[PDB]
Amino acid sequence: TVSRQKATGAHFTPDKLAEVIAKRILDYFKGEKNRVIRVLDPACGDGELLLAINKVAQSMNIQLELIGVDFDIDAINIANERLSRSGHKNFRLINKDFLEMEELEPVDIIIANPPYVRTQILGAEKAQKLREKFNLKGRVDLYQAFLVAMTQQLKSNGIIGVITSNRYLTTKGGESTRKFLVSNFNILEIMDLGDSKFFEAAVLPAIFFGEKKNKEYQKENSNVPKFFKIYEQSDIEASSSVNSEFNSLIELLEVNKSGLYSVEDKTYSISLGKIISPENYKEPWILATEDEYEWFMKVNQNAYGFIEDFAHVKVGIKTTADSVFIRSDWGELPEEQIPEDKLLRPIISADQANKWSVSLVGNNKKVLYTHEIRDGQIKAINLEEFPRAKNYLESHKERLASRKYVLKANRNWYEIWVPHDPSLWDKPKIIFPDTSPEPKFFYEDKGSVVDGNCYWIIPKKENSNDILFLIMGICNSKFMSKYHDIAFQNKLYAGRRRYLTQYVNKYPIPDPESIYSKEIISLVRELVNNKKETQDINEIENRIEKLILRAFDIES
DNA sequence: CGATCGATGC
DNA sequence: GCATCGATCG
Ligand SMILES: Nc1ncnc2c1ncn2[C@@H]1O[C@H](CSCC[C@H](N)C(=O)O)[C@@H](O)[C@H]1O
């Protein structure tokens, strides 16, 4: 199920992309450049990065000592053959685990593309060892441990050029990585390659260039960190101009002017600017232009608060066996195994998501809910009281009992892993999908369950009314989409944002007592009650955009 | 406990 | 194309 390429992260850097990284490294290198420079690739694969940096260095008449490490002998054998045939004799390859889970003196240059292996593939046990050894936190990825490991092999004032997944820039679990990078390096440049798809794998990579700090120093300050951001721009503004003077996508990585660029069948939006105070490592690092960052600043100052202050942003249920607990064909089961109607709760998924109004006009999904309120406490149901539902779960005994995290928690083998509080489903709530290219927050007061591909919003104050309607009008607006693309830059392919709790908690909210917020609430109340409204919903939506702009005191 | 994260995945 | 869904961590 898990390929050897998946578990070992064996994806080689393309030809032209490796050359781009090598050119930027040797341009940033302030070292001597007339002696032998030692270069390290801590996961060299077939030697692609070492070949690229030597080809560039030989043009500059620089002599390199190439060092490559890889724990796979097959990669070492092919890299030895390629390096030997290149003509360069001063190279050295080591077959070992670089993380050390027999010596090497520090190097002047590191060029790297470490493997990206998620915590689930590493396993919980190996992930704990990596966190304890390399001082990492959260859902650690392998490239994060390599980042710490390879940095400790770099001389002070040495240059690093390393390409990884861009997810440390915006995820909560990237906090330890951001802290380590800004602490150990004078950040030279961060390149967010976005959804350009240089690799055959579905990944959005970032390239980090930095000069390792020396323990004795100055103020630096003469170095201000810059960024380069390129994403696929599908929709083009009617008044925006496109530059088509570049032939290949790899040439766009060396442009030095922000704007729209078209290569073949796709248009790209390239942004250049400065990293703004990366020492604040607890929030995502924002890569935005001067105008975008200033607009982002004035919204926060004029904001009355944030969603986190007014409501609980929760995830839907996580059964950890969706094809067993969530079905639409309950009536088509054998009558001996059709669960009792008390247990089958209608559940809303992401494929029924629209703005304001739910697409519940066509739905039949129900969840076999396994929890209930008993003596004022949340307890799992007793199977003896539900014979038909018991037989159904008996047929799935081996798979449901395989969930080791359920048994080590001393919970019943048949339970839903995250059922939440059964009493909270009755409250009015906002629902929205996680993976979506557009906000689809909608009101729902029929007391149904929310699926794991959606999040839901319930107020902190027990007045489940106007406050939810205000939050909807804010979240669904184009105003908040602009704010989102600046502050929370976590994108999947095809322009999909991630509407996660850690992001939606930070949405700004205006004063719910101002006359502007009062009119927004009345318009949102109309959009959910008047399902006879069609097409001219856009008319109401436009009135909300101008109201939100006056509520935050800005014209965008 | 309850939200995260995805060299996405099928 | 286009929207995971289940191990995981705190
Ligand atoms: N623990 C470890 N120690 C050393 N190498 C490792 C490793 N885990 C994975 N690798 C190696 O890291 C490589 C990542 S693919 C990167 C290859 C090369 N850097 C390039 O850009 O083309 C794989 O070949 C894999 O064999």
Side-chain angles (χ1 to χ4, degrees), chain A residues 7-14 18 41-49 69-72 75 94 96-101 111-117 126 142 146 163 199:
Chain A
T8 67
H11 298 265
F12 296 163
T13 304
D41 188 353
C44 57
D46 65 9
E48 193 59 47
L49 298 178
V69 184
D70 199 302
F71 83 140
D72 183 13
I94 305 182
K96 70 165 186 180
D97 177 18
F98 180 76
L99 306 182
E100 293 177 350
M101 302 298 299
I111 177 168
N113 184 14
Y116 323 152
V117 183
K126 187 181 181 183
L142 194 54
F146 263 88
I163 172 168
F199 297 94

Side-chain angles (χ1 to χ4, degrees), chain A residues 242-277:
Chain A
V242 183
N243 186 319
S244 64
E245 81 186 28
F246 296 88
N247 292 336
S248 77
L249 176 55
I250 206 65
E251 293 174 356
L252 295 185
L253 300 190
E254 294 183 354
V255 82
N256 41 44
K257 288 143 188 171
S258 302
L260 296 179
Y261 296 84
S262 69
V263 167
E264 300 173 0
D265 66 310
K266 288 179 175 184
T267 304
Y268 301 89
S269 185
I270 299 178
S271 303
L272 289 82
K274 300 154 47 183
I275 297 297
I276 301 305
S277 61

Side-chain angles (χ1 to χ4, degrees), chain A residues 199-214 216-218 220-263:
Chain A
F199 297 94
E200 296 177 353
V203 63
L204 295 82
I207 319 185
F208 177 84
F209 301 96
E211 176 192 18
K212 184 171 189 185
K213 294 177 180 295
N214 46 344
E216 211 288 297
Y217 44 79
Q218 62 295 348
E220 197 54 49
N221 280 15
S222 63
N223 164 248
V224 63
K226 58 182 185 171
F227 74 89
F228 180 95
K229 191 172 66 171
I230 176 172
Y231 279 79
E232 181 172 340
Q233 172 82 334
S234 49
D235 177 65
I236 300 179
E237 193 184 30
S239 58
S240 297
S241 56
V242 183
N243 186 319
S244 64
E245 81 186 28
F246 296 88
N247 292 336
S248 77
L249 176 55
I250 206 65
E251 293 174 356
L252 295 185
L253 300 190
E254 294 183 354
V255 82
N256 41 44
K257 288 143 188 171
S258 302
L260 296 179
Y261 296 84
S262 69
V263 167

Side-chain angles (χ1 to χ4, degrees), chain A residues 376-395:
Chain A
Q377 298 179 327
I378 305 173
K379 296 197 172 306
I381 64 178
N382 172 238
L383 290 183
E384 303 287 65
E385 304 180 18
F386 305 96
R388 313 156 88 244
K390 176 185 175 185
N391 304 334
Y392 175 81
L393 300 176
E394 294 289 339
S395 56

Side-chain angles (χ1 to χ4, degrees), chain A residues 55 79 116 144 198 221 225 254 305 323 364 384 396 436 438 501 509 554:
Chain A
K55 177 187 166 190
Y116 323 152
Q144 296 167 352
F198 286 102
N221 280 15
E254 294 183 354
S323 75
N364 212 335
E384 303 287 65
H396 304 290
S436 186
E438 302 292 338
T501 290
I509 295 298
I554 180 56

